[PDB]
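cache lookup: miss for this entity combination. No prior model stored, computing from scratch. Input as submitted by user K.M.:
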Amino acid sequence: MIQMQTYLTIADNTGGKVAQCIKVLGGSKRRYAKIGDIITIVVKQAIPNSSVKKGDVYKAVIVRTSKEVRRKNGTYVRFDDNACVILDANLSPRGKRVFGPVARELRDANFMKVVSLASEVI
Amino acid sequence: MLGLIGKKVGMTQIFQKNGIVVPVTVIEFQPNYIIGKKTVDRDGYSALIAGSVDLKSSKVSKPIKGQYKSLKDIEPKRYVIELKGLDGYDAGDEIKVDVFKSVKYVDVTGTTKGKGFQGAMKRHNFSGGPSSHGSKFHRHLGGTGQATTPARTFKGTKMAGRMAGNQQTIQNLEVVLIDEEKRALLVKGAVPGAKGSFVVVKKSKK
Amino acid sequence: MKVRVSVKPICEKCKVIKRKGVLRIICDNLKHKQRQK
Amino acid sequence: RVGSKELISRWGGKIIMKSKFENGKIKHYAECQTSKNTARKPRDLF
Amino acid sequence: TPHQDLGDNVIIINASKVKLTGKKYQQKLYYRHSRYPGGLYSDTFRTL
Amino acid sequence: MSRIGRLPIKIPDAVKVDVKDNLVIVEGIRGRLVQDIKDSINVKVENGSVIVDRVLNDKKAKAYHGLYRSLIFNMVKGVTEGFSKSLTINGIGYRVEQQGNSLFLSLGYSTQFEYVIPDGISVKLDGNTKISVEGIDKFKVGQVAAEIRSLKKPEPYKGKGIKYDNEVIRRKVGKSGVKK
RNA sequence: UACGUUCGGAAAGGAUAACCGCUGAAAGCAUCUAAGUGGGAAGCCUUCCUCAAGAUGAGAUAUCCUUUAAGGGUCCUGGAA
RNA sequence: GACGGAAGGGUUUGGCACCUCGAUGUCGGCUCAUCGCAUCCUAGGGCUGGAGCAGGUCCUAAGGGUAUGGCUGUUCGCCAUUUAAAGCGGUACGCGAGCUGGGUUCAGAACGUCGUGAGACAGUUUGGUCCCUAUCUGCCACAAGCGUUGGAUAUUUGAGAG
RNA sequence: GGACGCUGUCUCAACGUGGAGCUCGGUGAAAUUGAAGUAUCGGUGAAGAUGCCGAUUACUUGUGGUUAGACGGAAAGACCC
RNA sequence: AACCCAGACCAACAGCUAAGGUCUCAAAAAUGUGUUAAGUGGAAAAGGAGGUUUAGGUACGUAAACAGCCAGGAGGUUGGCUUAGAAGCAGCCAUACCUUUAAAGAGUGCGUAAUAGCUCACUGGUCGAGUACUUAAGCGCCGAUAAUGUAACGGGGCUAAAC
Ligand SMILES: [Zn+2]
């Protein structure tokens, strides 16, 4: 349940460490993004001398949320912080590695390469 | 249209074979009998009168009693409805629950839960005023009309008043399970009415 | 196309007709078609 | 990709769908070769 | 007398065969209003 | 009025015509056609010929004169020789086929069009790109040919579509005609 | 209670706007129109849902009762109201 | 579509001083809408110097929808992300006996300018009470009495309406 | 003015508690008040109609809610002259 | 209230009239001759315009007018050129170019780099008398279009119950 102004952990090795959601894409009054949705983020904090500067606007995909969402088989998975991964123009991960686990709705949202680069899929 | 008088037992969930959960509502079907018939040349239209769970013999008025004089071994029925344009049955018959065995979707009609005198914010999803910044306006209507034109409140303006209690028919409920031995139907989703209220289940229109 | 108030023939091949109560111009040069507003 | 769902009936047939004509009225409509049941929209044949 | 009711009663038969002149059959409108806002309903002679 | 309204109607020998109570029946070798005639116009059969005149001289009657003359003439030419209007299907992958009393059209759309043929009308093919509607009534023949054409109206860039054979399609250019 | 779950926004038919016709005039031609005859839309009327015979136009009908009966109300214990 | 001509709309800025000074509370914002079509998008077309795609222009059509933030009291405007599209007007420039007082429009104080001065200034900044238990009409709901032509108890056709 | 932390201020509201409101019993006002078997729309009119014209709607009478109107009540407008 | 008719001493269950009307609501009309198809009547401009009634001119004709159809629609001569190309058709000067002359313009339009090609004006047959362009008067059509509800005859309705 990421909305506008939410802070997120960037979970990849581009350089950013904190991002802020500034828009939820795909819908007119759309207010919440869930796992596997694409948001527009601004970078609020980055590793020094990186390829990603603080104050740039990118698109990102949500990989962990702290609010559980129902699955078909009745199981709910609720992480412990909200985290996203930056994307380039092709809607593919800009980075080369992903830190920590991700949720398996990326599988269905067709982010197979994010899933593969993740460490654990829950 | 095939229909039955059932009782909403409650809700539960079941596990499909591969693990997918389906939330279901359970309906229990007391025996339903055909009490009479309505004919186009005598009543103006064709329908079958269907009845359900019995009444206590101390509280059946004689008009109701005489309604069942010609029927054999059919006690008076508390819930009576009409099924328009149906055939294949006649007075004294009895409808199984299996008439839905070939049906994929159903429609259920019942009396929705009553919520009493309810305000606008619950009744019509009205937003309210702010709860701070000096506001003295929390869950009131706001403005209702215009100034001088029309110098009245239009008919149908939404205000406070009673909420709920109407009939309602919900459409295209998937049929999950039929259990003849326990006289039960399991549909997927919600069904109007409180526990123990009586619904009418019809074959879906679409 | 040229929903106008003054409908006039443009070339000598345009022709004037009246249909269901409106005045119209019909021609082979479909670019010349017209109806009164 | 969640694999492109083969456009199938509930009776195992493909739904090829066609265009009837009748009396100015042009109709696009659904058809199954297994069961020959005619409707309009393949909603009604899953 | 206009005060009181002294005239007779009338039964009209064949009321569906009244003939009109002009284009009234297509153009005469019968209006009604439900008293709700915007609830103005028209009905031409044919349909009515 | 004008000479078409008064021009006499020849009757072929094989063709019979009869008038009675605001109705006309024309029975020929190939069929029988009927028509209504309005009160203001009178139709007469004499000397193996048909004549039409008007009781009044209002403009409605003036127009009716020619209208009914022409209709009865087409009503007689039909029962003797029948009417026929033809069509051509031009374009890559466009096809027409016949099964019984219906036609199947492949016209680029993602569905193959079936087409019930109304009664009283026959359809003739020439390969799979040429059609000819034949029948007793000119009105019906024109109607059918028109509705088939409407199934896929022609276009000016390449002539693709279903065209009347007698029609001439004005043609435009696309890319290479604008070459500088 | 939704921050939840489930379902619904169709399809089809009739008359039609703009538009396109067919057969044909007035005006030997031509023309969708003047006689007719048609196609044609998130639009209109049916269709989906709710209310509805105080609709005084007060409907239809199945049964009970025939000088206070049938039946209803009050009282009391209570609800899914 | 140059230069001109003929009209509508009564929303902008005005004219006029006809209703109102024993009081018609003035600008925005929030909540709540409704109506017009001169249609922002979705729908149905005509023509293009319309190849397709993407358009331009024009006709018909108001059923539904027509965004969130930074700045400003702001209407407006600008800017950043969007969306199939982020329409134009009326209704006391909708809506204070519904809310908000930021601004406008009191008495404080200071600054700029003018006046000898007292003071003045649609010049600027700050502080600066928003009253009232609903009689009728209107509307949102539930009942009492009564009629429906014998009196009651149930099942319903349906005008009409949402 | 900006930053950090914190939060129902907001998306977005829901539930619970306490005093009123609701019913009954006792006690018991106020301002206002020419009356009234006071419907609406389209028009006209001292130029925004409960009282007029045309048309439409509406069985009779209460109670609990909400103020759109009666240019509401309160202050012989404080602004202008 | 201001326009039109008409100056109230009082009473009457008397008559004739003005303005204004005579289908009905709502006291009062019918007959004759024309127009109107738009419900115009029952709002309005410029302008567009084979609406129609009536009247009057110019073109034109029983020696074959208009329309349709069947043919010709030419040559000298790319008319002179401008221009890179103009052949009838980017454009300029005129066609005071005659000729076999049916009749054929120094070519009407479309389309061609320029031509070609397809057509027109004109003329011959077929058929057979009004046609082709204007003017005057009476009713009409589009133009005609805002917001609480048909709302610009009072309404019902009316093709006269309109003028
Ligand atoms: Zn032309």
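stored under new cache key. The longest strand of chain D covers residues 15-22.
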